[PDB]
Design a protein around this nucleic acid. Structure first.
Ligand code: AGS
Ligand code: ADP
Ligand code: ADP
Ligand code: ADP
Ligand code: MG
Ligand code: MG
Ligand code: MG
Ligand code: MG
Lengths: 436, 426, 40, 426, 443
DNA sequence: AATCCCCTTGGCGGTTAAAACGCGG
């Protein structure tokens, strides 16, 4: 399998009482940050509060993104988690504020369940009947239609409305075709031709499909997880309509538009009604904005208003710089490049740099997860190199070392392989020196 | 693929042996031993496919072989593997955000191979008999090298054949499932065996192609028109999860590729901030970045940086450095270029070109070969001699001589302040 | 010019045809777009 | 009778067979070295071998750079595509600057193709729908009759052209275009007054087939494969009124078009004519355009781009601290060959004025022409060139044909130079 | 449709047969050197041979440069295109600067295609249209008469439909175009037999036409080159002629149109009438615009461009260096500059009198002298604007002439730039300064 | 070794002599 930078991160690695083990879940160290993230994960699972914000402050290569991804893993794949970077907010189709709002509502998941009844099988009969008296209706005076469907467990004779007969005619269904009728909506679908009539003609273009399993009339409960933004998009750009105008609009590109507050309010009304009835349940997710430094002052000012809303996820922010002038402003030096007003709404989770033992353990774990064998001496050399230049430099130099060892038909990386890798691939400081 | 001669046509590979040790001159590449060794390491990483989200910086002085190195890596990597080469100035668009453009570039370099097994009958048609309703009765006969049989048609096959209006005596191809008919000329060629064959067709697509296909009703036109627009992130998440499921099922395989940004020193700080995180996630290709400037101010920022790039990105990259050539390497590179351009230079002409390239620039001497060839042809001479190169030198100026002429006559050109003395008098 | 150097009488008939109207040889074309066999 | 422009007297480079340039031929005076260099470049273009070659015509204002470019175009001929441009033209608002540059690149590459045209024409004798249904039309001519079956699109075209029995039509089979050329002559006297314009019954057979050679560019093929471009059907109308603006054509479309063109050339039905892209006032380009021009020149299918500038040691637009020889960054300069253009002395100015007067059908006295030459030397050559028309107008108002010294003095007192106007401002 | 505007008083350049400017003619006063140069440019435009010349009009404000341009336009008259644009108009949002300049340049070249058409004119005698109910066959004949001839025409379907649409009757004099097919109702020959509705709405009789019933006439179609480009750019370009939204027309369209028009000229089908492009306040244009103007003037299908500038030495927009006229030296090298000077007292007085004649304001001698002194002291345009207000003040007084007291009242009520500047400097606290401070209270 | 009958060819216009032909029975 492919090995990304954060594959080894499987979780926060905490005990039942909340204490963080020294080395668990792929993490090494960062005890206080891991405990704070665990408390935040508990707060998210509580599903009571809206607009809570935390900011992961620390230097480069400290573990901000690692902690965010650990939070995402701990919450599970049923809770929303929308990653972002500060640069992605600057769209060219709609204002940055609308993009931020869309991301906010993309992280409030809703689990909506609907019971659906379907009639499916192979058509055996189709006998339209007229009214008992010609004066009963208008024109064709078509009464009910009788259809016989066959399944693996038997047959059933259905009585259908003339609308369903019109749908059957539209879908071009003949005897022997496998069909699919939804009693929820009255929609008729043509699955294909039965395998029974596969050899009727030796050359024919028909998608032969097997007879449906189970009974003809099966009732199933369908559960889907959809974000609120999905409902907003569905309302803004509905896919219904078969007019020429409808199709022409379908062909057009889907440019982002400033979805009005009225549409959001109506969606919230219908969702609240369904949550009250028990049909749907709310799952507040998490919004992660990495490199918050790149946001403009306008985005931060709008964040101030967004975080006070009644429905707002837990925004987690990462900043790797301190005492930096805020983008879009000339004079406001701010603690983390984040305006002071937003900082007052935040809880800062400080993450601390690593020592040699932690770097060595990280290199060990990364080599293990990479399916690479590393000698102890070469591993100590890598640890010294990482504490000399950077952890990421060593972590990325591991792979070329393995390739070099393989080119010599060696199962494990030796110190000479690491030295040759250093000679072939430089670092930032050495590149700066050689270019000077 | 017919095309004219470019400046990188001679580079047909990276010129490595089994042990990744580059030869002095192979596959069109000369010198740059350590750069080619590191490029071979990168190529092996790409071929392995187990490593994702690695950025390699190809830094060095101009006219040293950075683009040549990238071209050699691309050729040695071969086809059947994505390789997207975009200049850093292509990101800035009026229809796509820079982050969206970078995302589309990233997705373009990850390929997905999908195998489709189709049942198609191929043979030489002989007779077709279609009759009116007695819905339709039809028989077709297909002849091959060793069989001749009739087929009893149905309604839809008859309709399709009438729509195509297939004649007799022409090689035809009919698909049993899809129903598509591909016409071919009369049997140079001939049917080769059984009537109905079982051959699989493989489709190579990228993640971006799937994203654009699912973007709209007929989004696959946007892959040519270019009006894709900023795709919704939920669509990309759907594509990613379905690709994971398909790989688990074994019905589709992923072929990671290489993304090459030629002029990264033009991207702004937002692009680098995006790249930093885009590298971390899975399905991230290998990004090759070529830069030349030593220390410059990053676009969008007011401070210098070790390569024109922010320190956060340089921490995430491994740097391959290229070194300037010497006289012998210049000579052999010019010989390779002359052989590619079909120019027969003399020994003294080649020596003069080499000394000119060492004194002024390799590109200048490379460009003089064709001009010298045209000058010689005006004299009805085949081989390019010294005097032809000297006349080419006299007629065409290099950067240093042009600068010297401008400096010595600064009055007759327009300066930064907008002043010029057009009047030849006074 | 071609007839100065072939037969001469056929050239005289062609010259008379020139004198009558140029359309006796070639009509001015009906310009229309080039058609590609199949799109990409 | 005829109009005069800045370069109407420039008919060519005036180079002999050996390549040496006469002092005065083709409307050129002096500039021998630049003419010889441009002749070498013309020979290189005619070779049709290299791609992406670039040269720079560097010199001061009013020195003969645009004239040299137009002379190169004249020498190459109307067969080859020569695309004039200005640096300010690439700053579009519908698509990015990169797309415009690439489109102009592909507009300068020429293709000559052979196509067979199937044409039907005759008097309509039957209009029977087959029942959106096919139409059965019967065409009669002076040599025979013919009955055809037309697709529904052609039926829609005929329906919207108000074609009835007795009308004469013109169906082009390849494109599906229907033109109603009028009503048959046999019905001219049916009514004494109607709007119908009558035409004679067509001669020859109804089915006519001709082979025409048509010149297209790669940009034409790209536009054809990108967006719908013609048609008399409402479907085409909606397709083209939808997505009307320019789009950022992708590399995939260009690659597929290149494959199609390679197939056409291989079959022998097409031939390639690489041309020239002329970008005047290249100093107006931003750093991004130059950066992409670096990559675009490395393409294996590119024209011989010629650039002209009249600036020296000027800073590059976009950058703030890059001083460059001609406003062109050093990265692009290394890709270029510079042709230096030199100022003019008094005698050559005098001859240029004389020839310009001869071109515009003016008569200038020797003493008046000497005064005009000395004032052009004092102030500017172009200033002396523009003074000719007011002098001729003044002479005509005095019922005098030849220009005299007094008319020149009056024209000087009426119209001023830049220096004199600035002095008046002071 | 026009009102009394600033330059409404000039009907031409006022020149003799030898281009010698009259002391005062056609509305223009003084500016003898400028008027002679403008006449030379006028003759250059009328010749139609010299292409792509550039001419600059420089001078202090209120020296008559726009008046000179209006005089040139009036001397040109109709049938010779004149495109008056400002430097601010180029900077658009749907088109590039180069595209807008290209469209402005092409707007100044006119193409005339002359056609000969046959026209039927006469007074109707009898019209008769026979149509079957629930049937498509229609048959009709009409009798159209002239003073010397009368004839009957049996009509096709389309002519019957057209006459039915036009509501032609017996007492109608109509014209028929055999090619286009349009029917124009010129007038009536007599009354409509005294029916109830429409009793006396046809009193305006017209005389019966005279001569041959079917006569040939020539029709001239004048269309600018830009219109042809817009028509041939796309299929919907015809709508773009009125709506705008022409887009950036591809260069191939313009090249092909140029070739086709040159072929038309060589064939005698079309007559090309080049015109003048006039840019107000060219100093607002960017340096890119000036470079494009430099190149585009060398085209053979280019008009003659005239520009107005009063900035003296000033910073060219888009650059950080000052230039002699707000324009780069490259554009100054290929342009001939005509200069304007300040006006004497007598010239100001006669311009004021001309304006008073145009505004239909009767000024007394003393009032005119006071206005002239005020204009010399403050501004020509100030007194020009004061004339009409003085007329209104006189009307308020119920007097048909403007006296000195009315001008005094107008002077008191309405201020000049200098007086406003003085009042601002004296009371600076009552106005918002550049630093954003002002005192609102009075205590 | 210098001169007559036919050649030598486009587009014309007559003008009989088979080709190919519904139909009548
Ligand atoms: N050697 C020459 N012989 C004849 N005519 C010339 C010569 N050099 C220039 N001209 C003409 O004089 C004018 C000078 O204009 P250009 O040749 O365009 O000069 P230029 O180098 O283009 O100046 P710029 O850069 O466009 S401001 C044109 O009308 C030319 O046709
Ligand atoms: N506590 C930790 N244990 C193990 N690996 C870590 C830890 N913190 C960071 N890393 C590794 O270091 C690298 C940098 O992490 P990341 O969070 O992306 O950097 P930053 O903190 O600057 O955003 C990651 O690849 C991650 O695997
Ligand atoms: N190692 C090499 N082997 C062969 N040719 C080379 C090599 N390095 C450079 N060249 C040639 O030099 C020319 C310019 O090199 P280029 O790729 O532009 O380098 P850079 O991008 O660093 O300026 C290319 O046409 C290439 O063919
Ligand atoms: N020579 C002149 N003859 C007649 N009227 C003039 C003359 N010069 C200026 N004017 C009048 O004075 C006013 C000056 O306007 P304008 O020409 O726009 O000034 P400027 O030359 O500063 O553009 C105009 O309304 C015009 O009618
Ligand atoms: Mg990170
Ligand atoms: Mg390069
Ligand atoms: Mg020029
Ligand atoms: Mg004005």
């Amino acid at each position: 399998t492919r090995t990304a930078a954060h594959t080894h991160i499987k979780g926060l690695g905490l005990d039942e009482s909340g204490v963080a083990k020294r080395v668990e879940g792929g993490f090494v160290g960062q005890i206080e940050a891991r405990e704070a993230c665990g408390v935040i994960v508990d707060l998210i699972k509580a599903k009571k509060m809206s607009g809570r914000a935390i900011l992961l402050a620390g230097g480069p290569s400290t573990g901000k993104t690692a902690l965010a991804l650990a939070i995402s893993q701990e919450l599970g794949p049923k809770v929303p988690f929308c990653p972002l970077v500060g640069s992605e907010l600057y769209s060219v189709e709609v204002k940055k504020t609308e993009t931020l709002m869309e991301n906010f509502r993309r992280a409030i998941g809703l689990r909506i369940k609907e019971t659906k009844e379907v009639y499916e099988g192979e058509v055996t009969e189709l006998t339209p009947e007229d009214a008992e008296n010609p004066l009963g209706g208008y024109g064709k005076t078509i009464s009910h239609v009788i259809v016989g469907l066959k399944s693996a467990k038997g047959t059933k004779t259905l009585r259908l409305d003339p609308t369903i007969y019109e749908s059957i005619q539209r879908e071009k269904v003949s005897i022997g075709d496998v069909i699919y009728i939804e009693a929820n909506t009255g929609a008729v679908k043509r699955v294909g031709r039965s395998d029974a009539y596969a050899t009727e003609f030796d050359l024919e273009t028909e998608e032969y499909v097997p007879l449906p399993k189970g009974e003809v009339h099966k009732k199933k409960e369908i559960v889907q997880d959809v974000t609120l933004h999905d409902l907003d998009v569905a309302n803004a750009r509905p896919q219904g309509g078969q007019d020429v105008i409808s199709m022409m609009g379908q062909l057009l590109k889907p440019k982002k538009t400033e979805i009005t507050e009225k549409l959001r309010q109506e969606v919230n009304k219908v969702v609240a009604k369904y949550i009250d009835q028990g049909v749907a349940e709310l799952i507040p997710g998490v919004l992660f904005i990495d490199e918050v430094n790149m946001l403009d002052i306008e985005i931060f000012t709008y964040l101030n208003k967004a975080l006070e809303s009644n429905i707002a996820p837990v925004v987690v922010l990462a900043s790797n710089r301190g005492m930096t002038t805020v983008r879009g402003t000339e004079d406001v030096i701010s603690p983390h490049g984040v305006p002071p007003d937003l900082i007052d709404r935040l809880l800062i989770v400080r993450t601390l740099p690593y020592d040699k033992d932690e770097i060595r353990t990280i290199i060990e774990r990364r080599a293990t997860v990479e399916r690479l064998q590393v000698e102890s001496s070469a591993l100590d050399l890598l640890a010294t190199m990482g504490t000399e230049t950077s952890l990421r430099y060593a972590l990325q130099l591991l792979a070329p070392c393995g390739i070099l060892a393989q080119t010599s038909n060696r199962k494990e990386i030796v110190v000479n392989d690491v030295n040759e890798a250093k000679l072939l691939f430089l670092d930032a400081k050495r590149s700066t020196k050689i270019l000077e | 693929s017919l095309s004219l001669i470019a400046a990188h046509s001679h580079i047909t590979g990276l010129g490595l042996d089994e042990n990744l040790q580059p030869r002095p001159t192979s596959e069109g590449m000369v010198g740059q031993l350590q750069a080619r060794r590191a490029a071979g390491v990168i190529l092996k990483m790409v071929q392995n496919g187990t490593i994702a989200g690695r950025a390699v910086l190809v830094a060095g002085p101009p006219s040293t072989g950075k683009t040549a190195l990238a071209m050699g890596v691309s050729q040695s990597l071969g086809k059947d593997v994505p390789f997207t080469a975009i200049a850093g100035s292509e990101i800035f668009s009026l229809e796509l955000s820079k982050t969206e453009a970078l995302t589309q570039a990233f997705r373009k370099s990850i390929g997905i191979k999908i195998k489709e097994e189709t049942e198609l009958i191929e043979g030489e048609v002989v007779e077709i008999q279609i009759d009116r309703s007695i819905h339709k009765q039809g028989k077709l006969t297909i002849k091959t090298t060793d069989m001749e049989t009739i087929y009893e048609l149905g309604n839809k096959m008859i309709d399709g054949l009438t729509k195509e209006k297939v004649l007799a005596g022409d090689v035809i191809s009919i698909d049993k499932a899809s129903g598509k008919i591909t016409k071919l000329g009369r049997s140079v060629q001939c049917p080769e065996g059984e009537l109905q064959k079982r051959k699989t067709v493989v489709h190579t697509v990228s993640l971006h192609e799937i994203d654009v296909i699912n973007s709209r009703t007929q989004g696959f036109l946007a892959l040519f028109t270019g009006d894709t627009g900023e795709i919704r992130s939920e669509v990309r998440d759907q594509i990613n999860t379905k690709v994971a499921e398909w790989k688990e099922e074994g019905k589709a395989e992923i072929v990671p590729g290489v993304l090459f940004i030629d002029e990264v020193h033009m991207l702004d700080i937002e692009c680098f901030s995006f790249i930093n995180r885009a590298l971390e996630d899975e399905f991230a290709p290998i990004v090759m970045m070529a830069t030349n400037r030593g220390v410059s101010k990053t676009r969008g920022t007011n401070y210098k940086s070790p390569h024109g790039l922010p320190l956060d990105l340089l921490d995430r990259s491994i740097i391959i450095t290229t070194k300037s050539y010497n006289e012998q390497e210049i000579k052999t590179i010019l010989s390779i270029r002359a052989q590619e351009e079909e120019v027969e230079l003399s020994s003294d002409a080649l020596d003069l070109l080499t000394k000119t390239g060492v004194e002024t620039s390799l590109r200048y001497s490379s460009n003089l070969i064709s001009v010298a060839q045209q000058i010689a042809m005006k004299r009805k001479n085949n081989t390019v001699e010294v005097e032809d190169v000297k006349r080419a030198y006299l007629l065409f100026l290099d950067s240093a001589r042009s600068v010297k002429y401008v400096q010595e006559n600064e009055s007759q050109y327009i300066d930064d302040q907008g002043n010029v003395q057009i009047s030849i008098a006074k | 010019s071609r007839a100065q150097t072939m037969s001469i009488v056929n050239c005289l008939m062609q010259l008379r045809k020139v004198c009558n109207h140029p359309n006796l040889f070639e009509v001015r074309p009906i310009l229309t777009s080039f058609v590609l066999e199949h799109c990409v």
